[PDB]
Design an enzyme around this catalytic site. Structure first.
Site, PDB file in Angstrom:
ATOM      1  N   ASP A 193      20.675  70.501   8.764  1.00 35.08           N
ATOM      2  CA  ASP A 193      19.608  69.827   9.485  1.00 35.08           C
ATOM      3  C   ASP A 193      18.293  70.314   8.909  1.00 35.08           C
ATOM      4  O   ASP A 193      18.260  71.188   8.024  1.00 35.08           O
ATOM      5  CB  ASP A 193      19.716  70.023  11.013  1.00 35.08           C
ATOM      6  CG  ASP A 193      18.975  71.245  11.540  1.00 35.08           C
ATOM      7  OD1 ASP A 193      18.922  72.262  10.883  1.00 35.08           O
ATOM      8  OD2 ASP A 193      18.446  71.245  12.679  1.00 35.08           O
ATOM      9  N   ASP A 195      14.370  71.578  10.321  1.00 36.22           N
ATOM     10  CA  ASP A 195      13.641  72.057  11.489  1.00 36.22           C
ATOM     11  C   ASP A 195      12.154  72.084  11.191  1.00 36.22           C
ATOM     12  O   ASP A 195      11.754  72.598  10.145  1.00 36.22           O
ATOM     13  CB  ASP A 195      14.095  73.471  11.850  1.00 36.22           C
ATOM     14  CG  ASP A 195      15.587  73.575  11.999  1.00 36.22           C
ATOM     15  OD1 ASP A 195      16.092  72.970  12.971  1.00 36.22           O
ATOM     16  OD2 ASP A 195      16.264  74.198  11.145  1.00 36.22           O
ATOM     17  N   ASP A 249      15.181  68.692  13.989  1.00 37.58           N
ATOM     18  CA  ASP A 249      14.652  69.306  15.192  1.00 37.58           C
ATOM     19  C   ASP A 249      13.135  69.353  15.089  1.00 37.58           C
ATOM     20  O   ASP A 249      12.583  69.846  14.096  1.00 37.58           O
ATOM     21  CB  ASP A 249      15.217  70.704  15.415  1.00 37.58           C
ATOM     22  CG  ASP A 249      16.686  70.703  15.707  1.00 37.58           C
ATOM     23  OD1 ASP A 249      17.182  69.694  16.246  1.00 37.58           O
ATOM     24  OD2 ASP A 249      17.364  71.730  15.439  1.00 37.58           O
TER      25      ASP A 249
HETATM   26 MN   LIG Z   1      17.998  72.568  13.722  1.00 37.63          MN
HETATM   27 MN   LIG Z   2      18.380  74.379  10.808  1.00 35.12          MN
END
Ligand SMILES: [Mn+2]
Ligand SMILES: [Mn+2]
Ligand SMILES: [Mn+2]
Ligand SMILES: [Mn+2]
Ligand SMILES: [Mn+2]
Ligand SMILES: [Mn+2]
Ligand code: NA
Length: 325
Positions: A193, A195, A249
């Site tokens: 992912d 962030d 995120d």
């Molecule tokens: Mn994340």
């Molecule tokens: Mn991450």
DNA sequence: CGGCCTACG
DNA sequence: CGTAG
DNA sequence: GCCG
């Protein structure tokens, strides 16, 4: 070797990957059985080996190392003498471990949910899809996009996502900033992912920012899923002739909290648990991603940088690339 | 004996 | 419960 | 599982 991971540098590239990976299998398996204490010990032991300057070639080299007791040392011993550890191989090959790993890697599914499904006889992602009433909206999104979310996120992807997030943030609030955090800030070349941490230099101006950013991204067609100050999103990232889903995120913090949020969201996960444990147990101070609190004086430490936080805790500063515990 | 990070969604 | 590092 |  200091006993807390926040007291020693841990680089991204280290010399004991085979040993640490075996201990981390046992840690993950401990978690699947609901023993967070055993998970933590095996994680800590693996992390100690990542901080060593050279390969461990003889069991002698473990003597005195923190978090190595009878069990972790026997795992290393068998790996050194035979190249494999019977217990690790038994875990690896077990239906329980393989299925719990499969299910908990889904976004929206943790150990307790995965364990219930396992006890009900479910074993595959297709089993879950056949019973969609059993799923939250979050789990439906994790399953729908599971193939894409299992594809490594590359730096190319990070750079494209940072540009679209910067564009939406600038449209929502002039002067607001976007900082890459998470594993990529520690120097990882790949990730699960991306962030991002968002703030504004004038305290209070960031109030209400995240819904405005989300609206602006959704109306550019960039959002496949979202659910405030933390947004756990799945983005529709354009690719040549197509697109792929990517977990992103987005976190907003007021500038007074930014060093604490930057520290927390940069990780690693074990590094931050160890830092919070150190803060409380050794220094009597309570640390989270908002601040550092002295419970006797009932005051918060005013930090201008991550360096300030390390100093207040009596720790040598470590840059992000040495926080890979 | 009993802790093990500490939050938000 | 899930999420985060 | 290890340790304070
Ligand atoms: Mn994340
Ligand atoms: Mn991450
Ligand atoms: Mn043997
Ligand atoms: Mn808050
Ligand atoms: Mn006990
Ligand atoms: Mn993480
Ligand atoms: Na999960």
């Amino acid at each position: 070797m200091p006993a807390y991971a926040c007291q020693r540098p841990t680089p991204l590239t280290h010399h004991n990957t085979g040993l640490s990976e075996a201990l981390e299998i046992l840690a993950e398996a401990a978690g699947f059985e609901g023993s967070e204490g055993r998970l933590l010990t095996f994680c800590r032991a693996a992390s100690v080996l990542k901080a060593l300057p050279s390969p461990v070639t003889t069991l002698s080299q473990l003597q005195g190392l923190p978090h190595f007791g009878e069990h972790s040392s026997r795992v290393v011993q068998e790996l050194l003498e035979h190249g494999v550890c019977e217990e690790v191989e038994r875990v690896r090959r077990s239906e329980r471990y393989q299925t719990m790993k499969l299910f908990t890697q889904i976004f929206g599914v943790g150990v307790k949910t995965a364990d219930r499904w396992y006890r009900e006889g479910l074993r595959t992602l297709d089993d879950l899809r056949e019973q969609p009433q059993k799923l939250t909206q979050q789990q439906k999104a994790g399953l729908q996009h599971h193939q894409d979310l299992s594809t490594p996120v590359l730096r190319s992807d990070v750079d494209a996502l940072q540009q679209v997030v910067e564009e939406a943030v600038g449209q929502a609030l002039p002067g607001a900033t976007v900082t890459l955090t998470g594993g990529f800030r520690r120097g990882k070349l790949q990730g699960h992912d991306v962030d991002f941490l968002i703030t504004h230099p004038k305290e209070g101006q960031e109030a209400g920012l995240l819904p405005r950013v989300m609206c602006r991204l959704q109306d550019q067609g960039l959002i496949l899923y979202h659910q405030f100050e933390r947004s756990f999103c799945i983005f529709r990232l354009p690719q040549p002739g197509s697109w792929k889903a990517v977990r992103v995120d987005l976190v907003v913090a007021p500038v007074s909290q930014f060093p604490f949020a930057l520290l927390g969201w940069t990780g690693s996960k074990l590094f931050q648990r160890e830092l919070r444990r150190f803060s409380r147990k050794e220094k009597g101070l309570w640390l989270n991603s908002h601040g550092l609190f002295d419970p006797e004086q009932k005051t918060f430490f005013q930090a201008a940088s991550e360096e300030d936080i390390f100093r207040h805790l009596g720790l040598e500063y470590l840059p992000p690339e040495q926080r890979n515990a």
